[PDB]
Design an enzyme around this catalytic site. Sequence first.
Site, mmCIF file in Angstrom:
data_model
loop_
_atom_site.group_PDB
_atom_site.id
_atom_site.type_symbol
_atom_site.label_atom_id
_atom_site.label_comp_id
_atom_site.label_asym_id
_atom_site.label_seq_id
_atom_site.Cartn_x
_atom_site.Cartn_y
_atom_site.Cartn_z
ATOM 1 N N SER A 57 5.505 5.456 8.973
ATOM 2 C CA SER A 57 5.030 4.982 7.528
ATOM 3 C C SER A 57 6.182 5.325 6.278
ATOM 4 O O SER A 57 6.805 6.365 6.135
ATOM 5 C CB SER A 57 3.782 5.947 7.128
ATOM 6 O OG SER A 57 3.527 5.952 5.964
ATOM 7 N N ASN A 87 5.449 6.020 3.452
ATOM 8 C CA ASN A 87 4.492 6.884 2.308
ATOM 9 C C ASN A 87 4.342 8.161 2.658
ATOM 10 O O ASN A 87 3.629 8.778 1.994
ATOM 11 C CB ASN A 87 3.184 6.001 2.125
ATOM 12 C CG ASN A 87 3.439 4.712 1.731
ATOM 13 O OD1 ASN A 87 4.235 4.152 0.914
ATOM 14 N ND2 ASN A 87 2.511 3.756 2.406
ATOM 15 N N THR A 88 5.227 8.764 3.534
ATOM 16 C CA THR A 88 5.052 10.322 3.649
ATOM 17 C C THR A 88 6.772 10.782 3.745
ATOM 18 O O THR A 88 7.438 10.183 4.483
ATOM 19 C CB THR A 88 4.471 10.814 4.775
ATOM 20 O OG1 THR A 88 3.128 10.299 4.640
ATOM 21 C CG2 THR A 88 4.374 12.284 4.991
ATOM 22 N N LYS A 129 5.833 3.671 17.182
ATOM 23 C CA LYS A 129 5.479 2.671 16.231
ATOM 24 C C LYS A 129 6.848 2.886 15.155
ATOM 25 O O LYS A 129 6.897 3.843 14.714
ATOM 26 C CB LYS A 129 4.321 2.798 15.333
ATOM 27 C CG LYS A 129 4.161 1.314 14.311
ATOM 28 C CD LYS A 129 2.679 1.312 14.100
ATOM 29 C CE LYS A 129 2.708 0.223 13.010
ATOM 30 N NZ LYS A 129 1.065 0.071 12.577
ATOM 31 N N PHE A 150 -1.697 8.341 4.087
ATOM 32 C CA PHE A 150 -2.098 9.059 5.143
ATOM 33 C C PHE A 150 -3.343 9.817 4.635
ATOM 34 O O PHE A 150 -3.580 11.003 5.136
ATOM 35 C CB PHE A 150 -1.036 10.288 5.851
ATOM 36 C CG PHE A 150 -0.254 9.354 6.830
ATOM 37 C CD1 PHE A 150 -0.534 8.305 7.089
ATOM 38 C CD2 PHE A 150 0.983 10.340 7.325
ATOM 39 C CE1 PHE A 150 0.307 7.808 8.224
ATOM 40 C CE2 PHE A 150 1.658 9.906 8.531
ATOM 41 C CZ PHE A 150 1.357 8.623 8.848
ATOM 42 N N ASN A 166 5.713 -1.623 11.436
ATOM 43 C CA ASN A 166 4.995 -1.004 10.104
ATOM 44 C C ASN A 166 5.349 -2.103 9.188
ATOM 45 O O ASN A 166 6.100 -2.939 9.341
ATOM 46 C CB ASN A 166 5.132 0.264 9.932
ATOM 47 C CG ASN A 166 4.369 1.137 9.608
ATOM 48 O OD1 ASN A 166 3.578 0.808 8.554
ATOM 49 N ND2 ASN A 166 4.081 2.490 10.149
ATOM 50 N N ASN A 201 0.693 -1.425 -0.032
ATOM 51 C CA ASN A 201 -0.255 0.056 -0.042
ATOM 52 C C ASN A 201 0.846 1.205 -0.069
ATOM 53 O O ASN A 201 1.814 1.393 0.592
ATOM 54 C CB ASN A 201 -0.816 0.108 1.043
ATOM 55 C CG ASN A 201 -0.424 0.582 2.430
ATOM 56 O OD1 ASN A 201 -0.326 1.681 2.639
ATOM 57 N ND2 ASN A 201 0.330 -0.255 3.360
HETATM 58 C C1 LIG Z 1 -3.693 -0.827 3.617
HETATM 59 C C2 LIG Z 1 -2.908 -0.400 4.986
HETATM 60 C C3 LIG Z 1 -2.860 0.585 5.513
HETATM 61 C C4 LIG Z 1 -2.023 1.110 6.574
HETATM 62 N N1 LIG Z 1 -2.128 2.203 7.255
HETATM 63 C C5 LIG Z 1 -1.661 2.354 8.472
HETATM 64 C C6 LIG Z 1 -1.679 3.658 9.215
HETATM 65 O O1 LIG Z 1 -2.399 4.556 8.492
HETATM 66 N N2 LIG Z 1 -0.846 3.862 10.157
HETATM 67 C C7 LIG Z 1 -0.088 2.979 10.610
HETATM 68 O O2 LIG Z 1 0.621 3.023 11.566
HETATM 69 N N3 LIG Z 1 -0.071 1.704 9.979
HETATM 70 C C8 LIG Z 1 -0.684 1.285 8.895
HETATM 71 N N4 LIG Z 1 -0.407 -0.001 8.448
HETATM 72 C C9 LIG Z 1 0.324 -0.859 8.796
HETATM 73 C C10 LIG Z 1 -0.307 -2.048 9.783
HETATM 74 O O3 LIG Z 1 -0.751 -1.340 10.965
HETATM 75 C C11 LIG Z 1 0.743 -3.029 10.245
HETATM 76 O O4 LIG Z 1 1.733 -2.399 10.914
HETATM 77 C C12 LIG Z 1 1.472 -3.554 8.939
HETATM 78 O O5 LIG Z 1 0.432 -3.866 7.795
HETATM 79 C C13 LIG Z 1 1.829 -5.143 9.254
HETATM 80 O O6 LIG Z 1 0.829 -5.845 9.826
HETATM 81 P P1 LIG Z 1 -0.011 -7.126 8.888
HETATM 82 O O7 LIG Z 1 1.205 -7.958 8.233
HETATM 83 O O8 LIG Z 1 -0.888 -7.811 9.933
HETATM 84 O O9 LIG Z 1 -0.792 -6.232 8.060
HETATM 85 C C14 LIG Z 1 -1.310 -0.104 7.235
HETATM 86 C C15 LIG Z 1 -1.204 -1.235 6.614
HETATM 87 C C16 LIG Z 1 -1.973 -1.433 5.483
HETATM 88 C C17 LIG Z 1 -1.868 -2.752 4.755
HETATM 89 O O1 LIG Z 2 -1.130 5.688 5.002
HETATM 90 C C1 LIG Z 2 -0.267 4.938 4.637
HETATM 91 O O2 LIG Z 2 0.077 5.016 3.295
HETATM 92 C C2 LIG Z 2 0.622 4.098 5.670
HETATM 93 C C3 LIG Z 2 0.705 4.485 6.645
HETATM 94 C C4 LIG Z 2 1.383 3.656 7.603
HETATM 95 O O3 LIG Z 2 1.822 3.993 8.574
HETATM 96 N N1 LIG Z 2 1.958 2.555 7.055
HETATM 97 C C5 LIG Z 2 1.492 2.026 5.595
HETATM 98 O O4 LIG Z 2 1.980 0.947 5.504
HETATM 99 N N2 LIG Z 2 0.817 2.648 5.115
#
Ligand SMILES: Cc1cc2nc3c(=O)[nH]c(=O)nc-3n(C[C@H](O)[C@H](O)[C@H](O)COP(=O)(O)O)c2cc1C
Ligand SMILES: O=C(O)c1cc(=O)[nH]c(=O)[nH]1
Length: 363
Positions: free
Chosen positions: A184, A186-187, A222, A118, A251, A114
């Site tokens: 993240s 992505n910023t 995080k 944000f 993350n 992804n």
């Molecule tokens: C589509 C998507 C959006 C995410 N958005 C955020 C976010 O806004 N803030 C954040 O701290 N982590 C974000 N994450 C990361 C997840 O919180 C997690 O740290 C990471 O995906 C690993 O866990 P998983 O393998 O169970 O998905 C995002 C992950 C995905 C897949």
């Molecule tokens: O918003 C996102 O693009 C995003 C934020 C984040 O903390 N981690 C991530 O995988 N995506």
Amino acid sequence: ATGDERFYAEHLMPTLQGLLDPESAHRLAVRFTSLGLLPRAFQDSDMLEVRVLGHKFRNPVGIAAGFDKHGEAVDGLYKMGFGFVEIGSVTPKPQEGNPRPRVFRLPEDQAVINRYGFNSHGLSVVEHRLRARQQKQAKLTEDGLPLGVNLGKNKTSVDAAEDYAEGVRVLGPLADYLVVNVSSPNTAGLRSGKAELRRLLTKVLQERDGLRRVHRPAVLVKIAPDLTSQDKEDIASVVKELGIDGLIVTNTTVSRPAGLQGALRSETGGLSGKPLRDLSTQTIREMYALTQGRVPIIGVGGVSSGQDALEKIRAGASLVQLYTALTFWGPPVVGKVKRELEALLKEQGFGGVTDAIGADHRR
Ligand SMILES: Cc1cc2nc3c(=O)[nH]c(=O)nc-3n(C[C@H](O)[C@H](O)[C@H](O)COP(=O)(O)O)c2cc1C
Ligand SMILES: O=C(O)c1cc(=O)[nH]c(=O)[nH]1
Ligand SMILES: CCn1c(CO)nn(-c2cc(O[C@@H](C)C(F)(F)F)c(C(=O)Nc3c(F)cccc3Cl)cc2F)c1=O
């Protein structure tokens, strides 16, 4: 395995994911969950209860940030069986995020990439949404179902620390814990010396300490899975120096592990799911050791089974989260992970989750 688990994983989810674009699939899931339109959820046993971060957690399996960025589906997520819910990331002002498409499935890898960037309804909207259910949440938290709020920063902000401070002030009073998401992928500039992490976190903690006692959340940091050894040492040092309450580890990864098969493997963004799992577990292990086991860790990255959860717990996590597994297995994954984890705890001689936290370090 239940009937629902197999039907969801083998038939319903592959079918729906084959009919829908990935972001549409996400949006529909938030809608269904917000309405409580869910399969029947496993009864939490005493073995799964954990006390950490100033709260009881009925079970140690939470929903990771990113699924419910704007706090629209919190109650539905508890209905799904999660022991705690984390919303966000939330930015101070509303922002759209990156252009679509910005989410990519790698089904051959049980992974997602992804680059949402944000996308956020912003603090004001989220504040009012949480205020509408603030007393309901107080009762949920008392009953062992805490709420976390993950704070981000706006793309164009000229003062990152002030963005996080604003988040503390606005959503801190509504949260059991806050997350300073400095990871993240992505910023631009977000994941960036030691002195500036110290500066940032000092400001965040001062703002938190200025909230009234019943509205004073724990503060967690995080971190990425892509840190150097130096970065990890530095973070551990700062966390201990300032009394940060905990870590979320990890993350998504900007790495692309050898062996990815998905056609979309070279898309820009954070990789999640199975290919992240062990990189994350190893980061938990290192952070637990660097903090002498004195700093609670929420372990996250590639959890889809009880074994995955227990490996993170034994490595040092007090709690775990998942997201990506939900995209492949659907809602029944939550009960699956809990049932499998309880069984493994019993099989390995642990009285409960608490006894297993950091157990690998004592071998
Ligand atoms: C589509 C998507 C959006 C995410 N958005 C955020 C976010 O806004 N803030 C954040 O701290 N982590 C974000 N994450 C990361 C997840 O919180 C997690 O740290 C990471 O995906 C690993 O866990 P998983 O393998 O169970 O998905 C995002 C992950 C995905 C897949
Ligand atoms: O918003 C996102 O693009 C995003 C934020 C984040 O903390 N981690 C991530 O995988 N995506
Ligand atoms: C990473 C973005 N993403 C994706 C695509 O990668 N899928 N996905 C996702 C997609 C989901 O379902 C998509 C196909 C949906 F809604 F159309 F059925 C779900 C999910 O749990 N759905 C769901 C629900 F909310 C409530 C009841 C029943 C079901 Cl199947 C949970 C998810 F996390 C998601 O969040």
